[PDB]
Design an enzyme around this catalytic site. Structure first.
Site, short mmCIF file in Angstrom:
data_model
loop_
_atom_site.label_atom_id
_atom_site.label_comp_id
_atom_site.label_asym_id
_atom_site.label_seq_id
_atom_site.Cartn_x
_atom_site.Cartn_y
_atom_site.Cartn_z
N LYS A 175 0.83 -1.20 0.00
CA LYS A 175 0.00 0.00 0.00
C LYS A 175 0.86 1.25 0.00
O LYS A 175 0.55 2.23 -0.68
CB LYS A 175 -0.94 -0.03 1.20
CG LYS A 175 -2.04 -1.08 1.07
CD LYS A 175 -2.89 -1.17 2.34
CE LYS A 175 -4.21 -1.91 2.11
NZ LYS A 175 -4.03 -3.33 1.70
N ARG A 217 -10.05 20.60 19.28
CA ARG A 217 -8.97 20.32 20.22
C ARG A 217 -8.86 21.44 21.26
O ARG A 217 -9.36 22.55 21.06
CB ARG A 217 -7.66 20.16 19.48
CG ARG A 217 -7.71 19.06 18.46
CD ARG A 217 -6.32 18.69 18.07
NE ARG A 217 -5.54 18.20 19.21
CZ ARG A 217 -5.62 16.96 19.67
NH1 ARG A 217 -6.46 16.11 19.12
NH2 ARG A 217 -4.87 16.58 20.70
#
Ligand SMILES: [Mg+2]
Ligand SMILES: [Mg+2]
Length: 324
Positions: free
Chosen positions: A63, A140
């Site tokens: 991949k 966040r």
DNA sequence: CCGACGGCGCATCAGC
DNA sequence: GCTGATGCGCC
DNA sequence: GTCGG
């Protein structure tokens, strides 16, 4: 980051296996590979180079060659186009909706944020609050806000009983400049591995934080673990802060070091370290480290986090080097 | 080849 | 009610 | 999906 294209790819594959395929070991495999590549100090030139790292095997190496060659992964490109997979992946972003409930909602034709909002009576309590703060919980937390939050929690805990010790753990203790939530370890001398000499030790702290309007919602609550929602107070005329996830874990005071090792993490660091413990003939949880006989023995003496590392023959790693 | 993969708290449910 | 699974979450 | 034996 040096290899952010690759690590993002592997994280997206990880989330697919967890959320859609319900293949938890592939999820862990992808996240372990992503973590080991993230700290590799070179820009990766080939799958072969990556395969030298532990946790990267033949399939991920292939991949990685595809991604380096083309900038993308056909397998992921197809997944992004699948409506069921996209729907399930979205729904799992709500706290309290996991892979099974996500597939169940899609089955019932509940597959968008608007769908969820008009079907709140089909959500359990956790899911309802997760939906309520969907946007906030993906934001966040700046470390500057975490410091304010720490100050409130420690001072309000002090007001309940001067003998409590609250320690902020998680990514904050690892020195991160932003955190996804606040993790608070709590001890009190009345609660040891040998006796619980006082009831409601966690409840009293949660109540006080609710009284001062810091805790705003509860997702779950028991004698030792609170999971909920909190919010900094804002000043006159200024916009409110986003609501934030807060976890509080009450740990026996004599087991503080195992508990603070666990709650400091990272999650992947914990999985790596506990797997190494097992290879070394020990088992580590948030309370104890015990030898393996294959049945666990009696807890071993621990007077520092470093004692735990010594048992498994690891050089000590400060919190800031545990961000795997 | 193939078993193991970290360890556990709380919420929900099924069966008795 | 209790017990044990299962889902989901924490690091 | 990867690793160890
Ligand atoms: Mg955290
Ligand atoms: Mg947390």
């Amino acid at each position: 980051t040096l290899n952010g294209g690759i690590t993002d790819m592997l994280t997206e594959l990880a989330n697919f296996e967890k959320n859609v395929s319900q293949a938890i070991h592939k999820y862990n495999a992808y996240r372990k590979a992503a973590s080991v590549i993230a700290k590799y100090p070179h820009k990766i030139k080939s799958g072969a180079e990556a395969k030298k790292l532990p946790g990267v095997g033949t399939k991920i190496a292939e991949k990685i060659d595809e991604f380096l060659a083309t900038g993308k992964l056909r397998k992921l490109e197809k997944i992004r186009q699948d409506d069921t997979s996209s729907s399930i992946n979205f729904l799992t972003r709500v706290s309290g909706i996991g892979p099974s409930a996500a597939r169940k909602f899609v089955d019932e034709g509940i597959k968008t944020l608007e769908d969820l909002r008009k079907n709140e009576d089909k959500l359990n309590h956790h899911q309802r609050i997760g939906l309520k703060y969907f946007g906030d919980f993906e934001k966040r937390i700046p470390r500057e806000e975490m410091l304010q939050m720490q100050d409130i929690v420690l001072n309000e805990v002090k007001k309940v009983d001067s003998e409590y010790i609250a320690t902020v753990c998680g990514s904050f203790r690892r020195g991160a400049e932003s955190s996804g939530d606040m993790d608070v370890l709590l001890t009190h001398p009345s609660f040891t591995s040998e006796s619980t000499k006082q009831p409601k030790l966690l409840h009293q702290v949660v109540e006080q934080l609710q009284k001062v309007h810091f805790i705003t919602d509860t997702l779950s609550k028991g004698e030792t673990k609170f999971m909920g929602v909190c919010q900094l107070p804002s000043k006159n005329d200024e916009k409110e802060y986003p609501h934030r996830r807060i976890d509080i874990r009450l740990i026996p005071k004599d087991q503080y070091y195992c508990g603070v090792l666990y709650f400091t993490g990272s999650d992947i660091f914990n999985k790596n370290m506990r797997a190494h413990a097992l290879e070394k003939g020990f088992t580590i949880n948030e309370y104890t480290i015990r030898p393996l006989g294959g049945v666990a023995g009696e807890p071993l003496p621990v007077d520092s986090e470093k004692d735990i590392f010594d048992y498994i023959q690891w050089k000590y790693r400060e919190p800031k080097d545990r961000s795997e």
